[PDB]
Amino acid sequence: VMTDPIADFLTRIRNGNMRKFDVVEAPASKIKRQIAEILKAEGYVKDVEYVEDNKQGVIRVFLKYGKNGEKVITNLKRISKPGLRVYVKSDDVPKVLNGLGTAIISTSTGVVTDKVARQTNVGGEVIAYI
Amino acid sequence: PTINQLVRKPRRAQVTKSKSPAMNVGYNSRKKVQTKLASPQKRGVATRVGTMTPKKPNSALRKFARVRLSNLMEVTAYIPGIGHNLQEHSVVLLRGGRVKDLPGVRYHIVRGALDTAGVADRKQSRSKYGAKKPKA
RNA sequence: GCUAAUACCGCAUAAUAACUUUAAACAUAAGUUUUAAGUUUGAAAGAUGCAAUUGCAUCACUCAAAGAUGAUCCCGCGUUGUAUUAGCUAGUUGGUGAGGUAAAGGCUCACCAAGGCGAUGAUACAUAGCCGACCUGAGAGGGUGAUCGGCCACAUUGGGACUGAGACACGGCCCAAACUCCUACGGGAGGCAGCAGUAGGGAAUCUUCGGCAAUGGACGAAAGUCUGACCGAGCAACGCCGCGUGAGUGAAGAAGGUUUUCGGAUCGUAAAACUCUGUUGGUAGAGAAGAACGUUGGUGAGAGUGGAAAGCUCAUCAAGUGACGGUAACUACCCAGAAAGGGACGGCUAACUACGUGCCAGCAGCCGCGGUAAUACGUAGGUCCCGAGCGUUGUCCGGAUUUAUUGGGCGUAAAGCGAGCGCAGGUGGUUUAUUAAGUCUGGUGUAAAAGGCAGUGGCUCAACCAUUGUAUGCAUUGGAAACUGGUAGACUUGAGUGCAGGAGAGGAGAGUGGAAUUCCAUGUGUAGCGGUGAAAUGCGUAGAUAUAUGGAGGAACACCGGUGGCGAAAGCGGCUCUCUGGCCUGUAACUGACACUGAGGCUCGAAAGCGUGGGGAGCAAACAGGAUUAGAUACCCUGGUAGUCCACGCCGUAAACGAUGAGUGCUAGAUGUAGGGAGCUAUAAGUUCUCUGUAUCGCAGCUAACGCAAUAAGCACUCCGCCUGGG
RNA sequence: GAGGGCGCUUCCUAAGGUAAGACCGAUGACUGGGGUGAAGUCGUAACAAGGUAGCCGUAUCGGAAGGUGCGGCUGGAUCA
RNA sequence: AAGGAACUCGGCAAAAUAGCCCCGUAACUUCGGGAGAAGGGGUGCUGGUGUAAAAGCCAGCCGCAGUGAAUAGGCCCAAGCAACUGUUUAUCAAAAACACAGCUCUCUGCUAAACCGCAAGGUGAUGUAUAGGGGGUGACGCCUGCCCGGUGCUGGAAGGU
User: Fold this and answer.
1) What is the nearest nucleotide to B22, using C1' and CA?
2) Phi first, then psi: what are they for A87, rounded to 5°?
3) Which residue's C-alpha is at the least distance from the C1' of C662?
4) Which of A61, A106, B6, B81 gives a 20 to 30 Å CA spacing to A72?
């Protein structure tokens, strides 16, 4: 249902890249703008755009591929399910894929990255790895 | 696997059966359903070695002792080895042992016990079935 | 009868103790807090002494002035299983009063009020000392509570209660009971769950040993005293460590064993010899381990104690600090001489040939074996792993992800309720701001400890002990608005409600029509018809079937009818009415998240059957007759009861199916067909998009395979449910 | 005179009896099912369209495998 | 006394319990009952205070005894039969006998059938098949199997008589 646009959206990204196609979709939030923002900054998609007047505005996003439409994103998932707001510490925020994976956590400051979540002693909700 | 379902759910288990139903042996005060502090033996009694028919196609004949059990259980457990010296009203040790070829058993008998003699220099341990290291 | 008191006791003297007061800063439902008037009562006038500005030390009541210790109870937190552990509770639950207490407190008790708990587990039953800790698992954890430390509880059993500051008290009392002893029978006495030790019972004896120096406590001014606490000695290979019984040279297969295809092969560095050596022990034993501090006296310092006295504080010396004791250690080290065995060999994991066997006796955790040469067994040799321990079972952990939070599955292999609701409960479209509740940061609590990560010393070095840190929701308090929750706020962009469309076997009643079956008469004629592979079954000459008609009645309504529709399914098809849901197409007209669910509870619901009352054509359980064959209680035939149908109540179980839960999101296409919306193709034709439908193939994905795949067995999340090897 | 033990009844009251259970174990003439072993005997079923394919829920008749019937599904055939 | 049913075929008779209040109450059940189950307690008077509408309180006084006597259930377990209430031989027998609702079958379309009377007349009943008459059985629960040879009954007519 509508109750998880986060993993609905990341699952939809797995439809876009696993189906090897151009554009995925997302209604208008601020959190998903931070999703394509942070992960576009980490080089995984190629667009940040949404429908210009809608509270359900379609964030339609071109992807950042490999060399032949090749995947970059493989193990895409939401960590914290809607049945479990994952509340971890700040001091030993763990590594992902021995460093080969992303990490994005809504800390008390904001929703920051892996090592910025590690050594700044900021902690919050674990969201998504690759 | 909902929120309440995965909280109702324990790490439960149901297959829990130690192979020794045991009143070993024991502390005979008045009531003797004292349980369980099990031995690998019995300082008890049995009566008579009987002969057991083995399975198909095991053409043999094996020696089970008519095991006294005060807890309403099998009058049998296996006597290993060739021959036996015991008789009725003899204290009989109780190996925890099972043979698929021997039907209706749960236990064996410790041969090579205080009431057991044998012939040593056995190629397995020289000293079971009532034997020792040979003093010549 | 009387002493004595380092007993008692009246009785002024003690009042911030409690209250009696008078004002209030304070004060919080209660309230807490300074002073503003009146009350109880003390001693071992003791003690050793000292001596003296004739007064100075150890103490009990004077009793406070606090700390300190050790307790008290209340609350938060987690602290077993059985809902085949449902209704439970009578002082129960409130209020008032009183007694008590160290205290609020049905803490009790009186009186007056009737609540309260509980299906999100209360009571009742089993079971349990609990925790730190500790074994195993990489961890997650599982598991244990041994021994150590803390708390709790107990003292043959049960119950009271005094004392004591403190007990309802292992070695107090009193009562009872149960044993036992003595009794001249009239009476008395006791409880090793204290350390021993005895008898029970087993796997489970520490010894019926010393002293308190090495502390620990108790009094005593000190001395002293006692302590089965502790320290030690002795029992247990019961565990952990550490060394070893020989080492070095010298190996030929050597004598030697065994196999043996007659060769070769053991002894593998004592090896057959040779050279030595003292681990542990031989003996002589030198020493013999410091196990050790002052309390007792002196000196000197301080309070310098009206006083130096005396004494007290504590800065010195003298002074015993024993039990392991000639104790570990060390010299002389004696001779290789006193001092290694246990398990295992079919694999399963490394170690097979002589080998009586002959499925024989036996061996075994699994596969198993043994019936003629068995590396299975008995059997010797060689080997494979270990050691003062080996192996065996008894328990537990792991593997086992074998309840899969980490770390499951549900189409068939175990599984989606038989389907609907709309109770809790769960989950939440977007956005504005607050909130910091949760969430992250800082301070605060944390096991006395003991224990890990390190280090130190040491019984050597060992092992482990002693030490020293480190490492911790044990906690409470500042910040963070990024998420959730909440609080207020907004929009529709989900849902639904509007206005237009249609559609259907959607339900429920009220009726109607025809064909067809069977039967009532019936024309008028003769054995017929039945059934199969055939007939007997049978009926029928009482002459009929069959054919001519009209009537009667029940049932059901061929093409319509279809991978068609509707309905959650169950299911629904002559025709016509009655009132009747449910979608979809468009639509923002409108609410502004009203959403999804769904345990519980509720409803509906195949098929029969069961209740009452009808209707009773055809069909057909039950049964009969005839084949059938050995037989036929079956398939066939002849029949033929229940039953099938109608109103009227029930079961709640079906291959419920698609052995495929519900919600919604995503997306190669080839494809069906409905009915709309829109275009569309125009001088009538015929095409394209859109929605719910239901196929068929097949992209990706996909599984054990089979297969699924837009109405996913693909990729996600919320509600539920199942599932743990078989009988 | 106060007060005092005794003087002096009551309260709670430990145990014992009572009654009417409930729970739980042991126990039991005969007896229902199930499993095991023989290799007796009865039988053709279930398995191929396994000899009437079945498989369910249900009623009902058999010594028994089983049958008859209500309705449903292939986990069913020659291929209908 | 003491002892109890040992007497007897048999606790037969007597005994003993019972009132009122207040507790409490098993079994199965057709869910009402059982059941007054059982078993238990109290019960007199004096003053209070609360009893008058109203018990309970407090204390005391007493008592052998407190519905002081009279009057007023013995209970329980189990089985068979019958359901029950009713009725039943007065001059014997009260029951398992009868009856009874119930259930079953059969007969009767009306001037009923059936019945009474020679008939007439009348009942049946101002009744109309849910009614009337006869037969069985006797609630409720389960169930009612087989055999039409014979008998009777019904119906049919071919033939014999």
Assistant:
1) C394
2) -120, 90
3) A1
4) A106
- Method of determination used here: cryo-EM
Percent helix / strand / coil, chain B, rounded to 5: 5, 10, 85
Which nucleotides on strand D sit less than 7 A from a protein beta carbon? 27, 36, 38
**C-alpha–C-alpha distance, residues B106 and B110, integer Å:** 13
Quote the tokens at residue B123. 């190629």
A60: buried, middle or exposed (CB in 10 Å: 19+, 13-18, 0-12)?
Answer: middle
Q: Indicate the helix (H) or strand (E) that contains A124.
A: strand A124-129
**Which amino acid is located at B104 in the chain?**
G
Q: How far is CA B56 from the centre of its chain?
A: 23
- Residue B29 has which token pair? 């005060």
CA dist., res. B41 & res. B23, Å (int): 11
What's the CA A79/C1' C555 distance, rounded, in angstroms?
Answer: 67
Residues near B52 by Cβ (< 8 Å), separated by ≥ 6?
B61, B62, B63, B64, B76, B78, B102, B103, B104
Helix (DSSP H) and strand (DSSP E) numbers for chain A = 3, 6
In this complex, the answer to whether residue B9 has its CB under 7 A from any atom of chain C, a nucleic strand, is yes
Q: Which of A124, A81, A125 is nearest to B3 (CA)?
A: A81
Please list the residues that pair with B90 across neighbouring strands: B46
> Per the structure block, which two tokens stand in for B26?
């024991």
CA-based angle B131:B135:B136, to the nearest 5?
115
